[PDB]
Amino acid sequence: KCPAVCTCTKDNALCENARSIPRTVPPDVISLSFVRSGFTEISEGSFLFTPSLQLLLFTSNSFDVISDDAFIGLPHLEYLFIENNNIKSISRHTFRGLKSLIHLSLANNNLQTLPKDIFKGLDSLTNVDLRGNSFNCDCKLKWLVEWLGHTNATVEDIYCEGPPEYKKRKINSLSSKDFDCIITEFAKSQDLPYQSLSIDTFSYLNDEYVVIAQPFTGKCIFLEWDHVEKTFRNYDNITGTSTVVCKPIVIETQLYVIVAQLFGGSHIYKRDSFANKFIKIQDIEILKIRKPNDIETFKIENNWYFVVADSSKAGFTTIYKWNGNGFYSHQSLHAWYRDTDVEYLEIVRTPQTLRTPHLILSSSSQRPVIYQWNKATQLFTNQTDIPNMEDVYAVKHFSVKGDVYICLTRFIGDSKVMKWGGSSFQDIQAMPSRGSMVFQPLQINNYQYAILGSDYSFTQVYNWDAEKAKFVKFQELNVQAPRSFTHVSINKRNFLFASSFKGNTQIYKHV
Amino acid sequence: NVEEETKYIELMIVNDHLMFKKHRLSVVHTNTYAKSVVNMADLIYKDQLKTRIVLVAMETWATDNKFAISENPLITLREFMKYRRDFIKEKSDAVHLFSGSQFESSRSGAAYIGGICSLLKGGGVNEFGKTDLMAVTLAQSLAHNIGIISDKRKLASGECKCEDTWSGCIMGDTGYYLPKKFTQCNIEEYHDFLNSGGGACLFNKPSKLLDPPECGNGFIETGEECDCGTPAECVLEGAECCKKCTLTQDSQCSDGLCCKKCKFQPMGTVCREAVNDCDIRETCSGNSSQCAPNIHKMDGYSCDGVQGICFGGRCKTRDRQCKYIWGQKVTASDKYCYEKLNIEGTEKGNCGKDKDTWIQCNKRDVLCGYLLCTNIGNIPRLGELDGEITSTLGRTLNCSGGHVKLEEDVDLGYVEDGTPCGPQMMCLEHRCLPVASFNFSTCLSSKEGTICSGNGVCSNELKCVCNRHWIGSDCNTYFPHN
Ligand SMILES: *[C@@H]1O[C@H](CO)[C@@H](O)[C@H](O)[C@H]1NC(C)=O
Ligand SMILES: *[C@@H]1O[C@H](CO)[C@@H](O)[C@H](O)[C@H]1NC(C)=O
Ligand SMILES: *[C@@H]1O[C@H](CO)[C@@H](O)[C@H](O)[C@H]1NC(C)=O
Ligand SMILES: *[C@@H]1O[C@H](CO)[C@@H](O)[C@H](O)[C@H]1NC(C)=O
Ligand SMILES: *[C@@H]1O[C@H](CO)[C@@H](O)[C@H](O)[C@H]1NC(C)=O
Ligand SMILES: [Ca+2]
Ligand SMILES: [Ca+2]
Ligand SMILES: [Ca+2]
Ligand SMILES: [Ca+2]
């Protein structure tokens, strides 16, 4: 007798809202249809109790899996229409045993892929419908392009819905030639068994070094590259009770290091080539600089400078100038402000045509400030606030297509990306910051990346999209409380250093 | 005792106009944001100082500022306390200002030392910042009120140091990485302040908060009959007595100094002994689980013999003032040192400074002039030293003094107002005046020439605390009771 969820004639059964494939469909039916069904899976041998089927229809259903040999035991099946469904997974041997199949439809199921050899052994096929899906044109779809080229069956034109460089491409028009199967990733190099705040890189005597500030121990850890073992060793160390930043400056092949400390005051070290050591040659007064949080270096018309952001009130953010022997006070900025970060910028002010030096200051519960360099007075003036931005932690800039952009970081709320347009910064996009301390732009192999750190969740890596003029999700890293991201380039090898405030500092390989 | 008890800071928050603008002109946002700051400050205090910060009152200046906010925190503080004196009429142990602005000083706020329980000194001011940061700001502000000062003498000597290398300690300069702990030295200062007779208004336990009732909060709110604390610490006290904030079958109370195994402590039981000769002992009412509100002798009572006079439960002597500024090892100078130097009116001793010239003290107003100490050091425990330290020489007496500046106006190094300068005479603005000049209030008395009929002591609430077997508001009625 006809199952309750079905409506039956002598030859045909139409089932709706079935909770499982009924085992009690009359065994003499030759056409069977399932619509709006409850069951989520079609396991092997699901239709053995109706061995004389010539036609099967599935429409408006939701499936978790259609398994291997789902349609086995159906040697007379000539028509199989699977359309307008949600289907999570189809298996390689789903259609095995369907030697008599004349017309197969997989239309309008929003399929993103098909497993290799899915149509293997379907020797009677005259028609296959694949329209209305969402195929991703990658290496997994390569077999399909070949099959389309060799099959005698009639197949309509179908199109890639991804990846973006392939969207709306006619799949029938693809060749084995066209698969972009290689592609990059940030692979984990090694995990250094200690914590770190700020990481810096420099070039000294044609070798690449990495400086790591150890907050809790006191050390400024210098790393050196081993060209045979292909790892980083421990070049040398610098002791300072509470180091926050270790900024390297190279002036005419001589290496200088600025060491910002929260305790005991900040000091300036010089590398000695003869004695093969670091020498303490200058002391920054403890009363002018008290609570440093960031150091940035820059060069304006053959003059070397550096700026120290002071997060204390009594301590003013101060610019120092290289005068051949050491560094000395040049200009103080943002009095009584809790400056968190400094950023150096070279930006075009309308209607000029040349980039002029700029500084950006970020302070607690305050708007970011843009200072402009004045050549006449040899100091930064003309400050302007960046509107739309409250409580910004830090600012970092990058350049694409000649245009200049910046990345604004917040701890909570949303981080922002802005483009410079002559007179002011404009909104591009925004991203949710879950305990973020970093939003660092990086340019590797002429690829523009952006790594947004997070203390609460995973660190998100973004890539620049040329079509979108925006950052898109790329790869997802996992580091405990990231504090910085730095790019290290050594002989066509690109490394990514990720500082960790509670966990281990991590080195990544870019391949 | 007084340091093993749980203390409670009944705090009021005032939000200025700029703070209101910071939360987008929203009343509800300002309230919850301030409560967050208070709660986080509370979690800091609860852990180490054994003290709770409880929000008891709040108002927000939505229209405009009541006065001009200064970039100088000390200037701002004073104008706020003037506002507090004239316009704030709700009761609190301390009143603190939340400013949306940012100060042009080294500190993120300012607060009077030993200020709690006072009307003019009972408060502080705090600048805006992130929730976690302002909480620390409030903690170090309430710290000054509560008597905690980073002893610079022990800091320089290395006697007191913060063991936290990274986050540092609360009374230290604050940076991005916030402190979480007080030093042990801070704890002792806090203990010393209470033992000195300070923080009397801190022993009333608040019941109904400004939030929905919470069972397991350690506070008896609306609907609930009792509240032990946390299920972990309820085991220690209140476990048998209280079940799901409800009194058991055989229970009158849950926890408290006047509660013994779910029962009230009989009337007459000492629950808090006098910390000094300015304090009044407290006895259980027999009708309450908490110990009676900590009260003490009114302003005017003598202490340390006749050498001192009680003010706010604390003894004002020249000896203690010297210990307060220069250290415990320092003692006050002999009266002969004053009797010679102050009369001169030189830099080495005077009754104040008037336009580049010192005032020559009168012969009676000699004990109210330049403070003189012995065995002095070269670094004050608090404030900034302005100038150098005076050192002057049958016995030859070494007179030493010094100008210590907390405020531009307030100068430590002169005899504090209220300090005795003779029989029934005190110091007032560098002048020796009789007790009637201070206009002290008086309790009820039914016997002439006696305080409370000569059978009681006048409390700071202007009520008579009768001796044993005496009753009545005038303590004149005798009551015999074994
Ligand atoms: C497809 O056409 C080829 C011609 O090369 C033929 O050999 C093969 O048998 C045909 N197969 C099917 C399934 O149509
Ligand atoms: C430097 O490294 C050596 C060994 O690599 C270690 O023993 C020393 O303590 C380190 N010192 C600092 C300041 O990092
Ligand atoms: C910038 O400096 C120029 C100096 O020529 C002055 O005219 C202008 O008012 C300044 N603007 C600001 C915002 O300081
Ligand atoms: C508690 O005190 C009130 C007076 O305030 C008194 O009327 C009442 O009887 C007392 N309760 C007990 C149980 O003694
Ligand atoms: C006591 O005297 C002061 C001024 O000497 C005065 O301001 C105050 O009002 C007086 N107190 C009373 C209660 O009259
Ligand atoms: Ca920076
Ligand atoms: Ca109180
Ligand atoms: Ca409660
Ligand atoms: Ca008392």
Author numbering:
A (entry chain B): 41 to 551
B (entry chain A): 233 to 625, 630 to 718
Task: Recite the paper's sentences.
LGI1 is a 60-kDa secreted neuronal protein, which consists of the N-terminal leucine-rich repeat (LRR) domain and the C-terminal epitempin-repeat (EPTP) (also known as EAR) domain4. ADAM22 serves as a receptor for LGI1 and is anchored to the excitatory postsynaptic density through PSD-95 scaffold. The LGI1–ADAM22 ligand–receptor interaction plays an essential role in AMPA-type glutamate receptor-mediated synaptic transmission via PSD-9533–35. In this study, we present the crystal structures of LGI1 LRR, LGI1 EPTP–ADAM22, and LGI1–ADAM22 at 1.78, 2.67, and 7.13 Å resolutions, respectively.
We coincidentally found that the R470A mutation of LGI1 enhances the expression level of the complex. The crystal structure of the LGI1R470A–ADAM22 ECD complex was determined at 7.13 Å resolution by molecular replacement using the crystal structures of the LGI1 EPTP–ADAM22 ECD complex and LGI1 LRR as the search models. The LGI1–ADAM22 complex structure forms a 2:2 heterotetramer in the asymmetric unit of the crystal. The length along the longest axis of the 2:2 LGI1–ADAM22 complex is about 190 Å, which is equivalent to the length of a synaptic cleft. Two copies of the 1:1 LGI1–ADAM22 complex are aligned in a head-to-head configuration with ~90° rotation along the longest axis. The LRR and EPTP domains of LGI1 are connected by a 2-residue linker (Ile222–Ile223) and adopt an extended conformation. LGI1 EPTP interacts with the metalloprotease-like domain of ADAM22 in the same manner as in the LGI1 EPTP–ADAM22 ECD complex, whereas the LRR domain of one LGI1 molecule interacts with the EPTP domain of the other LGI1 molecule, thereby bridging two distant ADAM22 molecules in the complex. The C-terminals of the two ADAM22 molecules are oriented in the opposite directions. The high-resolution structures of the LGI1 EPTP–ADAM22 ECD complex and LGI1 LRR allowed us to interpret the 7.13-Å-resolution map and obtain the information of the intermolecular interactions between LRR and EPTP and that between LRR and ADAM22 ECD in the 2:2 heterotetrameric LGI1–ADAM22 complex: Glu123 and Arg76 in the LRR domain of one LGI1 likely form hydrogen bonds with Arg474 and Glu516 in the EPTP domain of the other LGI1, respectively. His116 of LGI1 LRR likely interacts with Glu446 in the disintegrin domain of ADAM22. It should be noted that two human ADLTE mutations, E123K17 and aforementioned R474Q, occur in the interface of the LGI1–LGI1 interaction in the 2:2 LGI1–ADAM22 complex.
